[PDB]
Amino acid sequence: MKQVCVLGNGQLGRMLRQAGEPLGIAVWPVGLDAEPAAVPFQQSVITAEIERWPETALTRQLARHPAFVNRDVFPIIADRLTQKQLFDKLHLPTAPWQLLAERSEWPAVFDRLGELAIVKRRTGQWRLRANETEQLPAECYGECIVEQGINFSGEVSLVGARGFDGSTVFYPLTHNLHQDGILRTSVAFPQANAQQQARAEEMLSAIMQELGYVGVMAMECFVTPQGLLINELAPRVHNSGHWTQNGASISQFELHLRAITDLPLPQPVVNNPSVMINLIGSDVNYDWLKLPLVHLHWYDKEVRPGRKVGHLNLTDSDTSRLTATLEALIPLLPPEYASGVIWAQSKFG
Amino acid sequence: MKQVCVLGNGQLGRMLRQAGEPLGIAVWPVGLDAEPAAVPFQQSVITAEIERWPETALTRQLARHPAFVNRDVFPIIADRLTQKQLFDKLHLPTAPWQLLAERSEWPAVFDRLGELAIVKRRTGQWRLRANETEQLPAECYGECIVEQGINFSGEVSLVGARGFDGSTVFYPLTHNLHQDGILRTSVAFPQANAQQQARAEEMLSAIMQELGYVGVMAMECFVTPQGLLINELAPRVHNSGHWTQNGASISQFELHLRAITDLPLPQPVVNNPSVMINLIGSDVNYDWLKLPLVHLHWYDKEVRPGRKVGHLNLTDSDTSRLTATLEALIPLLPPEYASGVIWAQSKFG
């Protein structure tokens, strides 16, 4: 019996545990509060569904763990500065940026970055125009970064994994839809554009290798006129990959578990397209289940506005049946969901 | 005329041949490269000065030889795993260990084995602390073993032999000094501690018998607070037994030859203490011969750093004369030899 402890007590941890079980792998999602005595830390591999955590009884001992996988990577990614610098080091396309040091810069920051300057904290964000300069916290100077405002045609993410052996497997690119800064819909086609897929894998491998990363990692990018631009990275299973639960032969959760426990890591097989619909601050509606293609993933979380409470995965070989199902779902969902659905739908047309 | 072929062309083979001659026993040290036509394999007993060898024209035919003595033992000893397991099977004290299987273990490996974990390959070694875990090759997992880090008071070896008849003879324990993983000095007293000597013979006989071993075998141990611990075994004449050339009535070389050719195997007689000083990557200095007690064994090998090129054996009934000689040798030897000499000297005081 293989064992794994997951630092973080959310749906990702729950979903990892769910995938673990049928494989004979025990996964123990742990909260930060928790006492080091409650979890089998001592005899398991340790992973995390969170990028950064506070210091506690637990996390203290964890930084000592001999088998806390990718322990050192988190921080690099946790900090926007270091993350951005990593892309730079590898010569990967990303949006032009620089850390915010002093007001003197302001003038030329607008010169090479243009009209809109996107300010961001290192550890939310501002969209300042030349005159809104004064609107920013003073505290920001040297703790906040600026990025060129990028106009993309679309967004995509590359989900893949790397093993201890340097082996690497990837899923097809997934098309994402964010609304109000929230992932709402993801679509995956079994056969992405081969060139674009190739271009993206190239960048993710360079990254994983450089980092000595073992396990599942997601890379978010913008589709632009001058190729793909790396936007952000996630050192863990990621929402945009949920569709793999029902749409691939090996899910992202399983994949993550296989890699860290040294299990085999062949390339997953995707035969059909999938559509994932994220459930945000909405209540369960068992009516959704009248559609046989629908697969409900309820996180069992107290419902709240803006809170991801579950997701729906749809996959089928029949795109018509697939689109029909989306339509049918419209009315069964709150209105805010309509846009996302049509969007998804818009992909099969 | 008895005949023997020695698989391996080193000093051990040379020394066996030297001992063979006056007894009317022809010994043919053979290299691996060699052609099966060059050696009288067909009409001799075959032995080896090496524990493991590659596949060749020679070694091919040898695995067919009807008189390749202890053919099957080598491999058992060649592999640390199987060796360690043999001690286990016989219930002999040895340092706590386990093969390295997975990172999950790491945590508890440090629990029962302690602070320092000694990693070793099966067929060099690492001394990893809990955090140096990541410093080990990935390849190691399941091809490398871990051993408890043992704190011994001293090191000793038991050299002895077993005949086809199950008869068994041993030399007194020999005190060894290793430096930088290299044997530097060995001291033997005619009368070892009777209990300790008894305890050690008990373990070596159990081993030889179990293995059906015929010939000379050496057993290296650690002297600890909870008795002797078997460290390692050598299925052949061993460096720590060189002193027997001049310090015993029957040398280890002769003994090895007698056993395998079915000659008589009475217990050798040791009347005095002996001191052997190994010549490592040093040049011959005929000045050493101004000391009448010194017996030089030059291997006739191209000199090289770290290479054992010869040894000096000293034996006498007069311990004062013996210690004086050691002192005298200090200056005639490179400085690196000083430590070993004083050590040896330290035993007569």
UniProtKB/Swiss-Prot annotation, chains A, B:
Kindly list the biological process annotations in GO that this record carries.
'de novo' IMP biosynthetic process
Cellular-component GO terms for this entry: cytosol
Cite the annotated pathway. Purine metabolism; IMP biosynthesis via de novo pathway; 5-amino-1-(5-phospho-D-ribosyl)imidazole-4-carboxylate from 5-amino-1-(5-phospho-D-ribosyl)imidazole (N5-CAIR route): step 1/2
The record's EC number reads: 6.3.4.18
- What's its catalytic activity? 5-amino-1-(5-phospho-beta-D-ribosyl)imidazole + hydrogencarbonate + ATP = 5-carboxyamino-1-(5-phospho-D-ribosyl)imidazole + ADP + phosphate + 2 H(+)
Family membership, please give it.
Answer: Belongs to the PurK/PurT family.
Its protein name is: N5-carboxyaminoimidazole ribonucleotide synthase
